[PDB]
Nucleic acid binder design. Structure first.
Ligand SMILES: [Mg+2]
Ligand SMILES: [Mg+2]
Ligand SMILES: [Mg+2]
Ligand SMILES: [Mg+2]
Ligand SMILES: [Mg+2]
Ligand SMILES: [Mg+2]
Ligand SMILES: [Mg+2]
Ligand SMILES: [Mg+2]
Ligand SMILES: [Mg+2]
Ligand SMILES: [Mg+2]
Ligand SMILES: [Mg+2]
Ligand SMILES: [Mg+2]
Ligand SMILES: [Mg+2]
Ligand SMILES: [Mg+2]
Ligand SMILES: [Mg+2]
Ligand SMILES: [Mg+2]
Ligand SMILES: [Mg+2]
Ligand SMILES: [Mg+2]
Ligand SMILES: [Mg+2]
Ligand SMILES: [Mg+2]
Ligand SMILES: [Mg+2]
Ligand SMILES: [Mg+2]
Ligand SMILES: [Mg+2]
Ligand SMILES: [Mg+2]
Ligand SMILES: [Mg+2]
Ligand SMILES: [Mg+2]
Ligand SMILES: [Zn+2]
Lengths: 81, 138, 169, 133
RNA sequence: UGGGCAGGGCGAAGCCCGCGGAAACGCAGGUGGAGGCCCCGAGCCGUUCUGACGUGCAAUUCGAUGGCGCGACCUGGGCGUA
RNA sequence: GGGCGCAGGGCUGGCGCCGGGGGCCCUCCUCCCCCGGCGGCCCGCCUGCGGACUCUUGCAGCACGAGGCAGCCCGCGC
RNA sequence: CAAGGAUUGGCUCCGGGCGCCGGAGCUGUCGCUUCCAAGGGGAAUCCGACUGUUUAGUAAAAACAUAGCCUUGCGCCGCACGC
RNA sequence: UCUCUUAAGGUAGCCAAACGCCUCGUCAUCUAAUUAGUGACGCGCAUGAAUGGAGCAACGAGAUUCCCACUGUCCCUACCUGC
RNA sequence: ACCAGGUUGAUUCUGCCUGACGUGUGCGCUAGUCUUGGGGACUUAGCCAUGCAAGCCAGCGAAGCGCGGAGCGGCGGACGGCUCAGUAGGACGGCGAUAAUCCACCCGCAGCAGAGACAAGGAUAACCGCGGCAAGCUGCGGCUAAGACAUGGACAGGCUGCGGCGCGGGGAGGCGCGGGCAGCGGACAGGGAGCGGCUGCGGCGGAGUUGCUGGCCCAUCAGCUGGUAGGUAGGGUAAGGGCCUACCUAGGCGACGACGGGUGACGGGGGGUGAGAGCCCGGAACCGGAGAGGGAGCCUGAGAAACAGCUCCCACGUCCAAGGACGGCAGCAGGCGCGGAACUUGCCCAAUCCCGGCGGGGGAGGCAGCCACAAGACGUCGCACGGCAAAGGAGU
RNA sequence: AAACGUCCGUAGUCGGCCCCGCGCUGUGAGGAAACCGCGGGGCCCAAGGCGGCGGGCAGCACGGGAGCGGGGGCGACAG
RNA sequence: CCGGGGACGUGUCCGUUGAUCAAGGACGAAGGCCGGAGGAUCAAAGAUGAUUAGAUACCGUCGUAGUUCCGGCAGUAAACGAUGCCGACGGGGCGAGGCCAGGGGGCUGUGUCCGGGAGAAAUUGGAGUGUUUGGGCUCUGGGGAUAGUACGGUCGCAAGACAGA
RNA sequence: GGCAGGCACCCGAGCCUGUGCAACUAGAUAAGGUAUAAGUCGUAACAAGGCUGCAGUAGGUGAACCUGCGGCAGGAUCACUA
């Protein structure tokens, strides 16, 4: 009962918008909707609330991050210093 | 596959090897059925359509007196070579002639190219009877 | 007619079999003689080898025994109370083998009270069987095959065999 | 439960339970002698006889309660290659309830040719040997 | 700043279990209920009949047919743009 | 903020039983019409004891404290 | 809903996981989504990708919009992933 | 291969196309018969690459042809009802 | 147990081609004798004119003139013969099973109802007439037989349910038999040529199911399966079984190749060819299977899903007076068609055997003819004899 | 003409040393004639006829000193 | 910094756990493709200046993709040692590896030279221990051409790849 | 209406429709392959084949082929702070 063989989360878009556009937005819609590990409580409960704001729903730890990921490459590099 | 219990593997493997053997390849494919001219049955008999000018393969320079023949059992139009010097004038149009192979396993014999069959009888009497005058064409 | 062969069946591996030869009389089957209650009508068939097989079409009574005391009567069949394979066969009152049927109690209660006159302890041993007898309920199973023998013989239900079946209907 | 009242054969000649000896130099299991199961297809307490080939195979599948799949592995000799072939056939074998729990997957089981018990069942388990033994 | 918009259909991720697998994973059954998805109700609109009407019911309406119908919608009020 | 669903739900209907009030009936029919705050518990959060389990229709939860027990709180509900 | 096929009423039961589901039997002038409600379908071509928008009152379209793609200007801006 | 000439000489594609005057082009298919449709052909009056070319999955009250089924569209009308 | 020719200017190789040998199919040319065998398998399991191919009898015995032979009755026609389409396991072969089954001839045994019994009842065909109808076929009336069909009469066998000890057999049992209670049911009313009926047990002769196992190719066929795998219960069958049905389990098979496809595939005993391992072939004598233009259904019978039986459909074909009636040569000859490719519309039951209770029948079968198709032996015209079913040939 | 670019990898196939069952094998049963092998046999010879003797089967029965399992002990210029 | 690796050394442990592979999986130069970043050199395409009989080329200049990095695709090479993996045995010499030992030493890599054997020969420590033919396992070839082409399949965004008449 | 006919079940040909599989065939057009008498255009390879060659990949050209990148020697080098 997989349902789809290749499209996965962008099966909601049906046949529309073109294969490459559905292929491009698939990595981002996996990214923006996923739960992430809170670095303040440890649990995989960080969800996006709005673009740029990521909040852990367990311990209410909210932090400003990337648009569709909690971390960007430019944002990671400034913090690793 | 040389162990004592490898017989079913060896039969499976060597049969797949044997499919690359060209003599076994024709029996496996059934090419003698794909061309019903001379393979499955000898002595194809058919109706002559026209006399054909065909030149020998060089260095030999001559003109073999072939004829197109449409078979009765198939309707296939195959070309056939007339032996026995001067026999091409003894065969005429709309004759019913019998054709034989060349003893070359389905290939051309000597200087002739492409022609895989040859006539032996015209109107159910042989060309050896006509080349020497033994019999008469009806 | 109906056949007995497996030439239409699939194989053990599920492969379909090719059906080529014409049907033989070696493996021929027949209709189910759905034997019902009524005045006795048996059908005679010259079956294989000339032997006459009698199947019962309608069938009124059955030679029923009481296994505890070794006496029998041909009491009339009233209705099929339970059939094991299908309850369709008891709704139509179809007499086959192993069909629990309601018998005529009159002929059996005459000898049962007669032995109860001598031995008073007999009624107490299985109270449930003698409970239904005074109500007039007497049940038996067909042990013969009426489509093969043409008869509906069997035995009276008694004991735990009876309480097994009265829970089933 | 059961569609008919559970009943056994009348024992000719524990004298209240019917059980027969199948012959061929075999023994009745004590689970068959001292048991309450009413399997009619059982070789010991039922209506089948053992006649014909008796082979020994290994249990392949114990699914589907009363039947089991018994694989008999044998060698066939290819005369051209002068080697053997590992072959096998699977048999749907009737497993009597007297062997319930005793026979498990892997045990070497001797099966005897019965009647055509089912469509694909012509053998019944008459004895067994555990894999660990 | 308020309000309005049947009922069905399809069944995306995720999840559960079974089966298969050395592994990666793959099938299958449920679950879940996504989408400017599908048929459609109130309603809205205006495809066709080139229907009715055409000094009309009407200075654009009526009927059938059709499309839309949780939206890139519709709507009351306030406000802005002359 | 919007939305499918789960649960609750101002209320509404049906059935059964009972109860008034009114009208109709060749036969049949019990026909037709109308009317009938307060305390405890339950949720769920939290607390105490205690220490590891535990759901949900659904993702899951849980040592940053599970289930359980005893409380507490505030609503829905009885 | 590709195409395409079968079935569908009433009654009396039986079974189940029981607002429903499955099965059987009986039955009618063969008839059952019985009124109502409620897709005609297939093979192709042209154009526009799509949902959407439009000439209130002769054009709803292939036009417009769209996302995408691209180019331009801008570090005095709402601050370049911007306008 | 030679030669004239341009800023460059139409490339990949595609086509009597909604773009072809001739023209009802030619060939094939579709038909009893087709200025239609489709598939080809291309010295294309005057196709052609974000003035976007090619491309049709999905979608369409868009434009077109064929087939099945259907029918008062017609042969060829008739009767009935309301107003 | 063999190589030879062919790539080069020459060489050594690899490599294939070709020669050289057997076999069988066809063609060609040629041909003196004899014996023996084979011969429309391949394409067309294509189509068929005409004749023939399975009939026989002892019961009863009509016409016809005691003879007689009709019809009834019975037995066979399910065997042989032909063919190889289908068939990849429903086959075949090997080894089993039938304790899961049935049965004709024949053989060996036991038996066959006292019933008014020194005795058996109604029919029908033949036949006698009268007809219908182109033909094929059929009606009406009248009588009349039985080893036909009944009646009469039950000691047993048998069937079913229940009960149930033993004695025998068997590897294994309520298998056989004895002992029980019920419900059924059920074997001679024949004859003055030998007998013939019927019931049972045991064979024999068959037959149905069935287990294990072996046997072609394709993976450019990798997953298959829903009555599918199992259980319970009933049905049905001669008989076990998903054989079928009812309800219920979720099974069953597969790279140890399932499943699907292909096959110009009947299988085998075998044949060919090679020193051998192998490779190839098996239409073809014998055995088994299957079929009778394609099908399906059935009657009778012990045995057929029969085909020189029936019923129908389909495809071909024929006759008709137009209402109807017929045909199935993969039997034997023979014709056409097909193709490369295959014989006389001969004689006969004499031999080999079969059916029938004997005198009969047998295109099974033999004899001859045709054919260089094959094996073997041998050269370069007319009497008598001889044999033969008859003729011819061999042999003097 | 032809070692898959590499590595992993399951079925498959193959696999260290020491210390009743099964494989393998011998004989025998039972297995049609034709055929085939052999052997006779003056059909005028021959092919033959006819008569002897044999073979066939990873089925069955009996036998078999070795081989393999089972279980311990080594710890392989095996891992 | 994190991770890995083989060889050696060892009275360390386990004790046959192994070898090879259909299927399957992972990695896989260059060029290519997708999205993002970047762009010095070089440079397909393109543009020129020449050469030339012609020159769409070689030469000069310029120049885009690309070359670069990150995430992925792709999955090919003369991916060669044109030499599969594992294992037993087999002559000397010289070298510049690593570890050990201290006794022109042992293990393990690595080249080389000369012989043996092999081979049609070139050659070759395996291409040896092969008609005195048998260690295991996998793959491939079967005259040339058609052709690594077509069809069907699977994979891929595509290019195409695999497989394959 | 008991040799008719009827009803239900069962076996079921045959036909029709839809579809799977297997195998065959027509076709405008258009692409290959092979053989032609060898004609035209060249000369890519074989010598450092006159730009070393080859295969891969990408693009391009009337055409062999050319060019870029990385390989390879089957090279025209077994050879130099030894
Ligand atoms: Mg919508
Ligand atoms: Mg709509
Ligand atoms: Mg509008
Ligand atoms: Mg708690
Ligand atoms: Mg439909
Ligand atoms: Mg469609
Ligand atoms: Mg649009
Ligand atoms: Mg308008
Ligand atoms: Mg675009
Ligand atoms: Mg152009
Ligand atoms: Mg036209
Ligand atoms: Mg038209
Ligand atoms: Mg441009
Ligand atoms: Mg334009
Ligand atoms: Mg729209
Ligand atoms: Mg008469
Ligand atoms: Mg009369
Ligand atoms: Mg065949
Ligand atoms: Mg044969
Ligand atoms: Mg090579
Ligand atoms: Mg790369
Ligand atoms: Mg790159
Ligand atoms: Mg890029
Ligand atoms: Mg430059
Ligand atoms: Mg392809
Ligand atoms: Mg060069
Ligand atoms: Zn947190």
């Amino acid at each position: 009962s997989r349902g789809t063989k290749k499209v996965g989360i962008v099966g909601k878009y049906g046949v529309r918008y073109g294969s490459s556009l559905r292929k491009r937005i698939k990595a981002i819609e996996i990214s923006q909707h996923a739960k992430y590990e809170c670095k303040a409580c440890g649990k995989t409960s960080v969800k996006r609330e709005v673009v740029g704001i990521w909040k852990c729903k367990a311990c209410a730890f909210t932090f400003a991050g990337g648009a569709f990921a909690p971390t960007t490459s430019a944002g990671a590099h400034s913090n690793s210093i | 596959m040389k162990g004592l219990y490898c017989a079913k593997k060896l039969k499976r493997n060597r049969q797949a090897k044997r499919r690359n053997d060209p003599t076994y390849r024709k029996r496996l494919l059934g090419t003698k059925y794909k061309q019903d001219i001379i393979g499955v049955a000898p002595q194809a008999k058919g109706i002559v359509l026209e006399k054909i000018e065909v030149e020998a393969k060089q260095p030999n320079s001559a003109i073999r007196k072939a004829v197109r023949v449409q078979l009765i059992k198939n309707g296939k139009k195959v070309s056939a070579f007339v032996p026995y010097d001067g026999a091409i004038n003894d065969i005429d149009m709309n004759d019913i002639v019998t054709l034989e192979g060349f003893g070359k396993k389905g290939r051309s014999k000597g200087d002739i190219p492409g022609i895989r069959y040859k006539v032996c009888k015209v109107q159910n009497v042989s060309l050896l009877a006509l080349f020497r005058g033994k019999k008469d064409k009806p | 007619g109906l056949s007995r062969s497996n030439r239409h069946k699939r194989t053990k591996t599920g492969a379909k079999k090719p059906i080529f030869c014409k049907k033989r009389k070696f493996h021929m089957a027949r209709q189910p003689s759905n034997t019902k209650i009524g005045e006795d009508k048996l059908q005679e068939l010259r079956c294989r080898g000339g032997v006459i097989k009698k199947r019962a079409l309608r069938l009124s009574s059955g030679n029923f025994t009481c296994r505890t005391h070794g006496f029998s009567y041909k009491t009339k069949i009233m209705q099929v109370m339970y059939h094991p394979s299908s309850n369709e066969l008891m709704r139509t009152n179809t007499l086959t083998k192993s069909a629990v049927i309601k018998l005529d109690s009159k002929q059996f209660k005459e000898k049962f009270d007669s032995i109860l006159s001598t031995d008073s302890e007999l009624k107490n041993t299985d109270p449930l069987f003698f409970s239904n007898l005074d109500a007039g309920k007497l049940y038996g199973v067909i042990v013969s095959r009426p489509g093969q023998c043409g008869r509906a013989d069997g035995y009276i239900l008694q004991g735990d065999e009876l309480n097994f079946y009265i829970n089933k209907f | 439960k059961a569609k008919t009242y559970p009943k056994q054969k009348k024992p000719h000649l524990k004298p209240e339970r019917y059980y027969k000896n199948i012959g061929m130099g075999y023994n009745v299991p004590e689970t068959a002698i001292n048991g309450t199961y009413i399997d009619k297809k059982c070789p010991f307490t039922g209506n089948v006889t053992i006649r014909g080939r008796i082979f020994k195979g290994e249990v392949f599948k114990m699914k589907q309660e009363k039947t089991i799949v018994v694989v008999k592995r044998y060698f066939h000799y290819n005369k051209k290659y002068k080697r053997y072939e590992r072959r096998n056939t699977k048999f749907n074998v009737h497993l009597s309830p007297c062997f319930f729990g005793l026979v498990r997957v892997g045990d070497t089981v001797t099966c005897g040719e019965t009647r055509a018990l089912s469509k694909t069942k012509h053998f019944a388990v008459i004895d067994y040997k555990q894999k660990d033994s």
